Ligand binder design. Structure first.
Ligand code: NAG
Ligand code: NAG
Lengths: 50, 22
């Protein structure tokens, strides 16, 4: 099974590992488009409570 | 591919879903 190199990945690190977060009243809404979205880090990582 | 407002007659002098720059 062969596919192109897994590059041009979507920057989930700019969302989950952000230095500053918004309030719930007015949250930050980042558009994620035109990429490879790797969710294995978010799913398997033990840093998340849920 | 933004919802752009263009001039009545656009020229060059001398909501977005896609963006790319070379
Ligand atoms: C945030 O950075 C840490 C650095 O130790 C990394 O282990 C973690 O997976 C990163 N979180 C995300 C969502 O990439
Ligand atoms: C962007 O689209 C939404 C939904 O149609 C609209 O309510 C909003 O006013 C638009 N923003 C601009 C700058 O056109």
């Amino acid at each position: 099974v062969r596919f192109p190199n897994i590059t041009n990945l979507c920057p989930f690190g700019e969302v989950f590992n952000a230095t500053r977060f918004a309030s719930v009243y007015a949250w930050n809404r980042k558009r994620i488009s035109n990429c490879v979205a790797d969710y294995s880090v978010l799913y398997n990582s033990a840093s998340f409570s849920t | 591919v933004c919802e752009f407002q263009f001039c009545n007659d656009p020229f060059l002098g001398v909501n977005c879903t896609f963006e790319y720059v070379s």
